Each structure stands twice: as structure tokens, then as C-alpha cells.
Structure 1
Amino acid sequence: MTTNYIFVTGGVVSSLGKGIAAASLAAILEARGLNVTIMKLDPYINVDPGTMSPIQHGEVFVTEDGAETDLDLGHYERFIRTKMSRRNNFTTGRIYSDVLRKERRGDYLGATVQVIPHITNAIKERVLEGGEGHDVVLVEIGGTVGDIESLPFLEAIRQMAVEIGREHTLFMHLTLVPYMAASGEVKTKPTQHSVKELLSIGIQPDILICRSDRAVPANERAKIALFCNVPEKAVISLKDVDSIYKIPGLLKSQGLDDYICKRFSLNCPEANLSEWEQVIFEEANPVSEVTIGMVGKYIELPDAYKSVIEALKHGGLKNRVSVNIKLIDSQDVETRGVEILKGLDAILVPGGFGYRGVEGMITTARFARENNIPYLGICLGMQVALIDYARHVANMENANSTEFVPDCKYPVVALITEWRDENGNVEVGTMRLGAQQCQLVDDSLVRQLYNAPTIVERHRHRYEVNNMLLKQIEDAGLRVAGRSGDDQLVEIIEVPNHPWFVACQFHPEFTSTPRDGHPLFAGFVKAASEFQKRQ
């Protein structure tokens, strides 16, 4: 069977729901038994998000293969069970970098290297590479139609549609249908103008996804159909919803997947969304409520912790608990003290880099440990927990990471090459990215929760637990719950004299889904519920 492509574009505005819409449509098609995948084409010049600030861009998502990618690939993995890799995300930067290397080498044989065909050919080659061996490939085009930055992507997919044929390619265009308070009407005019802009680049949209703060009524959908060369049944209402997990159902009920399967001549059973119906049911019917403090250094942009916030929500679903997530600036713990950590049923310290706000997180880890408040530490969260214990239990004064204080006496966290003891004595690829097997210690809390001896979780860090100083911290009562590799690096630590204290080096939020949840976050939210009840 020929691979089919759905090119997903956005008009009028960004922040429109392109990624969620693509992920939601992919979920419907996977629920019909189809082999589906999604890829994100980002128009920014960064070769990849590896170097990009969480505050500016949102979280850096990590795939099994260790690619640093757009957070949209997080949405993809939470909506479909196809595993994402490097091939599922690429930037304008990547494309120009590759073409420039081929040019400077001499691969183009003295030819003038042009946006067309050289840049467009490089785009098409990466789309085909990502799409090969799937029934349906959804290709999310970042940016807004009419902007300079996405034109090469739009010209590339236009060429692909002609080459491959309209029997195996569809253009799905999102637009904004805004509400005007004064007249009490939703407005199709931006959709009319956006479709003309998309046509002016050479693309006739097949499907229009109308985003609005309410349902787009039949009169407005008919008006959009009339002006845009699109049949009325291919003009789809996608209103603002209180849960994105409802969107697969909303799109199915408007026959979007029927329309797509008809165009692609795919004979497949009706979409079974029973698992999504269960997720929606669980979320709408919590029995208890908990407040969980997320104490970090990037709270000014919540999307910095997209996968963590979702993983906590998924913890709620499995326990039938409504999780109130309180984003707390760790620098406010440094300034105003531990007073701002009161009325929390649990505390989570997520990932981060740089010393700014870290002392606040160390204080937070101490507060949670001493007051028996459920604690989950992720990467930096497990560093500050180890530092807390080293300082305040093992009596290793001013214990720190070499990242923050390079020449500290007790570098409990440091690079493998930097490993030294308190006397400066030493033993006789630094960045860990992507999936790695971790061995769980018998009788550990995590061994019970994961219900297995070994687990596969994803890393994004280079600063490790210093094995030379570990024995002293272990003797002071701290437990090693997980290890990995030949160098037996510490992956998980637990404080046993505590209802629920777990900290891990890996990013468990990256394997959490609404349908399958996550053993660690489910345990954490349960502990939060049990704590809330005891008060």
C-alpha cells in the first residue's frame, strides 16, 4: 500500500492547536488499526532545541534514540503508540546546515544552490524518510501561512502533493474563527483571507479545522465552504475544550477520519475510542483533590514543564484524584523562606541547569524530607535531594554540584571525569541522552511501583552522583534504589524513613501517557492523596 500524507498547516495566528489537532487525528486513525506517524517541521534556525532556553521555547522533549526535539513530539507520544525518533522533527537550521555541508564538500558539482530545488529537495527527502513504511503520515508545518519563515516548507509539500498525487496527499489547514462580543457572532473572514493566502502559495486546502472559543455553527461552516473551494463536510469545528483528550471524539463525530479514509481509499473498521472515553470519564469524576507544589526555576513559562504537568494529571486519572498543580519559583523559597511551601499535599522539583534557584530547591527538598511531605525529584530534583541529605544528615558541609560550585570540598554531584573525594583524591561522551536500562534494587519503593527488576527511562544530563562520596551518604541512611551501566551510575535514590520520597536522574514524564499513566507519578499522586487525608 502507498504511504498517504496529511500536511497540517495553520493560518491567522500561531498557538492555534496544530500539534494537538495532528496528534488527535492520528489517535483516531491508530484506533482504526492504521499504522500512523507524525512529524514536526519547525521554521526556526536552531539546528535543534538542544541549546534552546526552556523559558523561551518550552520543554526540550527527548526521544528513545536521544534526539532533543520540539515538545509537540511529547503530544505525539501521548496520543499514539508509535515511538518518535530524530526523523520525526527537523528545523530550517538542520535543512540549511545539511545543504551548506553538501555544497562546501562539492556534492552539487558546481551548480547554483537555490531555495528551489536544493532546500525544497532536502525538506522532501526528510519528510519521505520519516513517512516511509506507514499507512498515514501527518506532517505538522510550524509557523503561520503568509509568514516568510515557512514558505520553503509550504513549497516543498506543494511539490510532494503533485509528485505523489492527490489520491495519497491531503492539505489540512487550521484557522481562527474569533468571537466578537458586541455582535455576538463568530467571524469566518480570517478563514476566507487565510485560505486565499494559502492558495497564493500554490496550496488548495482539502480540510479546514476551525478553531474558536465555541462550536462554529452550520451557517458559518457553509459560508467557509462557499468561499474556500472546500465541501461543507470537510469544514470541521474544533472549539476550545477543558481537556484535549476529548478532541479525538469531537473530530470523529464530525466524520473527519471517514473523509480521510475515503480520500486515501482505506477500508478499515470504525475508530474504537473506548480508551479515550475512559480517560475523559476518569478526569470528569475525581473522588479526592490534592495540591502539589512544582518548585523550579522556569515557572514563568509553564510549557517549560509540559510533560511533567501532564504526567501529574495522568497520576490523577489512575487514582481518581484532581491534582491542583501550584507552580512555585524556587528563588521565592530563597527570599521568603519555606512559608510559601505550606498547604502542599506533595512537592515535585523538576529538571534544570545552572545554579540560579538551586539553593531554594535544596531548602525545598529538606522541608519535604523533614516534614514527611511526599517528594519526587527529577534530574536536578534528585541532585538537590542528594545535596540536602549530604549537608543536613551525612554532615558534609556546603556539599554541592561542580556545575554550581566547581571547587567545593564535597562534590556529591559532578562529571565522571571530575569525581574526587573530600581530600581531592581520584580513581585510577559526557552527556547522556535518550533511553537507557536501569536496574531497580529489591525492596525499594520504585521496585514495587514499577513492578519489575529493570526499567527503560530517558536521560538528558551529564552531571552524575559522585560514587567516591556515595558510601558516606549511604551510611547516613540514604538508599540507592536504581543503578545503570558499567560505571554503576546512581539513577534513583530513596529516603526510607518517609511515607514517599523518590528522586531519579532520568525524565519519567517523557514515558507517561493519559491511557497507560506512569507507575512513579501514580504512586506520587496516591502518596499526595494519603498525606492530604491524614491532615
Structure 2
Amino acid sequence: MKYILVTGGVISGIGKGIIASSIGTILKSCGLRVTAIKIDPYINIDAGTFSPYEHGEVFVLNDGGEVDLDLGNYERFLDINLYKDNNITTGKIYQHVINKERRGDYLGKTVQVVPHITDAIQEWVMNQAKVSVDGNKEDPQICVIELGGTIGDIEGMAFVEAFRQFQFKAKKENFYNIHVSLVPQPSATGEQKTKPTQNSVRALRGLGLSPDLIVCRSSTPIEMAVKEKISMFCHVNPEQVICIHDVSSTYRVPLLLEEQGVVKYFQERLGLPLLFKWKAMADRYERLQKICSIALVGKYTKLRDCYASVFKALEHSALAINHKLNLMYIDSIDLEPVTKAEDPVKFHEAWQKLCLADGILVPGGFGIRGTLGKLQAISWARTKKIPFLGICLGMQLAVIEFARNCLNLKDANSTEFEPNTPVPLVIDMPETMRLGLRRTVFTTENSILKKLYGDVPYIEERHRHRYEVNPNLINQFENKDLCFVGEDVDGKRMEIVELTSHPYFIGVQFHPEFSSRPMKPSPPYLGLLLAATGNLNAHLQQ
């Protein structure tokens, strides 16, 4: 096997996941079966505990793993599906080692970080790198390991020590360390500063890893003097120092690595014998003259990474229909009448952006905060015939609103927001949390989604929810405009709803965005973009 370790130097937020994913898609073009592992040095077992504002969107895997968004980037660049154990955390490692100790598996000897934690990491990495994520009954050739955090993070030091050892178990032909670092330029009249990269590589060397490649992130391109200053003071050849400046799209990041010679480096060092798909999507993305204005009405809008996969799925869809996406992130609390009292400028900005909405997206979330603002946007969408996609909570709120406003059941809500709701429409219906891949079956042939999903009887989609539509109260909707077109295989759960009277007003209980790929956009997001540009009927008839 081959292993690539991507390390981060100065700060985490430099697109180290996109570098790792781009390295993977380059190797994939070179004919390697690629898997990926994300190491997150946090003590948390899973991302299911997190606020979105902390690390971005909680990505959901088929097995019900709640993990970091970087696992989603692997799945978008490489058409793989990952498992829980492709996320390693300090929590998982320390728990595993503790559990072994209590059984006596360490033979009455003192358990300590070296060897026992570092051995657990190596064991995990070896054994999970052998697991097929590619959908082939064949072990992959190469694992890209991303070491999340920075090389200054004390929690990460066990992992770097593990990789120091692993570099001398697996041979130097099998192990490549890539170091992603920031080169800041505080003003355009000042130089690009290399010192943080020098200092970071000195730390990395102190922990026993030598960069094979150093990936210098900057705004503007790196000057040759600055490249030589990195070469000298990081003790590395100029061929190994690559410049990843800011660009138009992720689609160009593989190409920029190709241009900077990374493909050649890997071909030489691995002994191999292209990115035309990437270049096609990249060049196409520039040439788009048309705009689709989509409103994302989201409580977590304060950091755009909180809706990363959702935005990506819109862009996949928008690219496929040759439109630019104007994604109007609207903080839903600004649409609420509270903000009309307290800060009315934000309210009339938010509602103006909602007027300019060619389509409306109401993504998921947990809690009652911002939920009245979501209901305002859904009311607007329903009545003014503006294309609507509701995901999880956005389905629940649409069903609730239709009950309130069209069935006159104004008392209707969820047992999340008001537990003692008079007519409990949206109830907790556990399996625990309905988490991971589940089979949803269509029970209405004339549904728009069935056609978009390719006239299939069932779909398998990723869920992350506790609450459901209360199956008795479905009788209220029975012969009205709002039809529950998709159910679970066990029938008692409604997982898709459509308004029959609207061009596109779709609620799905699942999260389609996790299943979205560049050359296979998630059908619900496609329908939205199509409807918003009138092209829906054309696409359906074609």
C-alpha cells in the first residue's frame, strides 16, 4: 500500500481538505483506487455533539457516522462512500486503548502514549486503509490521511509520532508527507512572509517528519524570491515547494497542483505510467453568464461552512444547467417580526433578498431558534409560487404550515418546539435517531421527484433526524394539495412531501446534499434550480 499524510502548519482553515481531495483525484486519474482517512485530534468521538458554528456542517455517512465536512470533500472529489472508522479521533483511540487495558490485552504492562496509543493509530490506519470505500471488492492502493489541526496542536503530537514510526514500517517509497502552510501578506506593499512556514517545518522536523511537498497557500501568487526563501529555510528543493494561490473554483485546484508539478512528482516517486473532467467543469464555470438567485434561509448563516454540502449541491446543479448561483444566505431570525422592532434595516434587507428569490431553500437544523423565520419564507414560497426545497426541518415546517394555513389547524406544531402541542403533528419517532442510509419508497407515480430520480421505485438517502410526521394526523392531508409521495419501507414514516398545486414545492426528510457529486447532482436540488429558471418541464419532458 501507499500512504500520503497531509499536515497543516499555521492554521486549519486554508483548504487542507481540498488539497487532500485534489491529491486523491489526481491519483484516481493515474488509475489508483484511493481511500481516505481524516484524523481529528479532538477528544470528541463523533461530530454529532457539535454546533455547526464550531467545525462547519456535520456530514453524515451511510452507516450513520456523524463526521467532519472534510469527509464530504473526499466523497465529492472521489466517488467513494466512507465508514465511521475513516474518521479517527483522539477520543476513539483513547477509548479503544482504555477498553483493551480493562480486558488485560496489554498483558499487565503500563499503558502509555508511546507505544500503545501510537500502535493503536497505526493498527487503525493499516486496517481501515485496506477497506474498500470505492464500491469494488478489491483493497485500495493508496490512503490519503489528513491530519486535521495544526502541527502546534498538542493533541495531534501522538499522531505525528505514530506517523514517524509508520514511515519506518512502511518504507519511504510508501510514505509521503505533504505540508500545507500559510504565507501571509498583511499589505500588498509589504512582502509575502515565509517565517510561519519555516517555523512550522522546523516543528514538523522536530517531530520526525520531513516534507516531500510543501504547499504554500497565499492570496496572490508566490514570488520566486519567496519560493527560494522557503526552499533554503525549510531545507527542501524548489521542485517540492508549490504555490496554491486563490482561484475561481475548487475545480482548478487539481489543475494548479498538476501545473506546479505534483502529478509528475507522484508519477516519478510511485513509478506510474487526464484531469479533463476537472478542466471542463472549471472552464465551464467561468463562462456562465446567466444567474439563478437562490435564497438559503438558514439560522447558521453566520458561517457559510454550516451549510457547505448544501451550497455544493446547489453549485453542482447550477453548473449542470449553465447558470451562476447567487446564493443569498438569509439569517432566518431577521425575517421574524422581533427584528422588525429591534433592527428593521436587517428585516427589510432579508425580505428584499427573499423578494429577489428565484428559488428558496430551507435547510435543516435543530431547535426553535430561527424557525418562525423559516415559516415566513415557506409561507411566501407557497403563496407566491416561488420554487421551494425543504430539507428535514424544512419538510416538517412545510407540513406544519399547510396544517396551520390550509387545513386551519393553527395549533399545529412539533413536540420539539412545544412538547405539549394540542395537535402534535411532528412527533419524536425513534428507531435512537434515524441516522444514515435508509430506503425511501415512492407511493405516488405522478411525483416530480420520482421522475428527477430517474423513475426509480425507491431511493436510498442519508437521514439524520428524530422527529417525524405523526401517522394518524396524515388523515387531515389525505385528499388535499399536500401529498406525502415518499414513505419508508415500513410505511409508518413519511419521508417526502410535495404540493401538487405548485411548480416545485418539495419537502424531503432526508439530506440529499450528502449524496451530491459534480457530475451527478442531487435530484431535489436540480429540480429547484430548473424550476427557478423555468427549465423543469423541458428537463422532465427530455
The verdict on a shared fold, with TM-score over 0.5 as the criterion, is yes
Shift in Å, 1:531: 9.6
Asked if structure 2 preserves the Cα contact closer than 8 Å seen for 1:315 and 1:518, the reply is yes
The one-letter amino acid paired with 2:152 is G
Q: Secondary structure at the match of 2:460?
A: strand
Can you list the C-alpha shifts for 1:98-125, whole angstroms capped at 9, x where unaligned? 1122223332232111011111111111
| Counterparts of residues 306-455 of structure 1 (less than 5 Å) | 306-335=308-337, 336=340, 339-340=351-352, 341-416=354-429, 429-440=431-442, 441-451=444-454, 452-455=456-459
Q: Which amino acid in 2 is paired with 1:217? A: E
The 1-side partners of 2:422 and 2:188 are apart by 67
Partner of 2:215: 209
Say which SS state the counterpart of residue 329 (structure 2) adopts.
Answer: strand
Contact 2:79/2:517, CA 8 A, preserved across alignment: no
CA distance in 2, matches of 1:181, 1:328: 32
Q: What is the correspondence of 1:135-146 to structure 2 with a 5 Å cutoff?
A: 135-146=141-152
Normalised by the length of structure 2, the TM-score is 0.92
> Aligned AA for 1:450?
Y
| TM-superposed deviation, 1:13 | 2.2
Q: Structure 1: how far apart are the matches of 2:186 and 2:380?
A: 49
Unpaired runs of at least 5, structure 2? 131-138, 341-346, 537-542
In structure 2, C-alpha distance between the alignment counterparts of 1:461 and 1:48, rounded to whole Å: 16
For 2:149 and 2:298, the matched residues in 1 are separated by 29
Quick check: 1:397–1:410 contact (8 Å CA) kept in 2?
Answer: no
CA shift, 1:243, in A, is 0.8
d(CA) in 2 for partners of 1:80, 1:384: 34
- Where 2:165 maps in the other structure, the secondary structure is helix
Match of 1:472 among 435, 454, 476: 476
| Secondary structure at 2:373 match in 1 | helix
Asked if the contact 2:441/2:489 (under 8 Å) is kept, the reply is: no
> Given the superposition, is the C-alpha separation of residues 411 and 182 from structure 1 closer, same or farther in structure 2, using an over 3 Å criterion?
closer
Q: Does the 8 A contact of 1:14 with 1:144 survive in 2?
A: yes
1:184: Cα distance to partner?
A: 4.2
* 1:74 CA displacement: 1.0
Preserved CA contact (<8 Å) 1:55 1:298: yes
Q: TM-score, normalised by structure 1?
A: 0.93
Q: Which letter does structure 2 place at the counterpart of 1:329?
A: D
Aligned-residue offset at 1:178: 1.9
Amino acid at match of 1:435: L
Q: Mark the CA change 1:210 to 1:413 in structure 2 (over 3 Å): closer, same or farther.
A: same
| Superimposed CA distance per residue, residues 454-478 of structure 1 (whole angstroms, 9 cap, x where no aligned partner) | 2121000011111110121132321
Query: 1:430 and 1:415 mapped to 2: Cα distance?
Result: 10
- Do the aligned partners of residues 308 and 182 (structure 1) sit closer, same or farther apart at CA in structure 2, a change above 3 Å counting? closer
Whether the aligned pair in 1 keeps the contact of 2:35 and 2:143 (CA below 8 Å) is yes
- The Cα shift of 1:182 comes to 6.2
Query: Identity of paired residues, percent?
Result: 46
1:99-114 alignment runs, 5 A limit? 99-114=97-112
**Partner residue, 1:50:** 48
- What is the correspondence of 1:195-344 to structure 2 with a 5 Å cutoff? 195-265=201-271, 267-268=272-273, 272-335=274-337, 336=340, 339-340=351-352, 341-344=354-357
- Note if 1:60 corresponds to 2:73: no
Q: Which stretch of structure 1 is more off in the superposition, 225-234 or 320-329?
A: 225-234
Kindly state the Cα deviation for residue 251 of structure 1 after the two structures are TM-superposed.
Answer: 0.5
Q: Quick one: distance in 1 between partners of 2:404 and 2:446?
A: 26
State the Cα deviation string for residues 114-151 of structure 1 (Å, max 9, x = none).
Answer: 01111111111111122122211111001111231210
Structure 1 residue 180: deviation in Å?
4.8
Q: Kindly state the Cα deviation for residue 183 of structure 1 after the two structures are TM-superposed.
A: 4.7
Match of 2:93 among 92, 95, 111: 95
SS class of match (1:442): coil
Query: Counterpart of 2:135?
Result: none
Give the match's secondary structure for 2:335: helix
CA contact (8 A) 1:363 1:388 kept: no
- Match for residue 156 of structure 1? 162
Residue 163 of structure 1 aligns to a residue whose secondary structure is coil
Q: Which residue type is aligned with residue 59 of structure 2?
A: F
Equivalent position of 1:516 in the other structure: 520
Specify the code of the residue in structure 2 equivalent to 1:448: K
Q: Helix, strand or coil: the match of 1:413?
A: strand
Q: CA deviation at 1:244?
A: 1.4
Q: Is the 8 A contact 1:374 1:501 kept in 2?
A: yes
Structure-2 separation of matches of 1:342 and 1:197: 53
Aligned positions, number: 515
Q: Secondary structure at the match of 2:396?
A: helix
The equivalences for 1:450-461 within 5 A come to: 450-451=453-454, 452-461=456-465
State the SS of the aligned residue for 1:82.
coil
1:424 is matched with none
Q: Distance in 2 between matches of 1:487 and 1:416?
A: 13
User: Cα distance 1:182–1:362, how it changes in 2: closer, same or farther (>3 A)?
Assistant: closer
The C-alpha deviation readout for 1:322-347, integer Å capped at 9, x for no partner, is: 11111112222222378452221111
Residues 345 and 531, structure 1, Cα contact 8 Å, conserved in 2: no
Q: Check 1:342–1:38 CA distance in 2 against 1; reply closer, same or farther (3 A cut).
A: same
* Secondary structure class of the residue paired with 1:164: coil
The equivalent of 2:136 in structure 1 is: none
| Structure 1 counterpart SS, 2:24 | helix
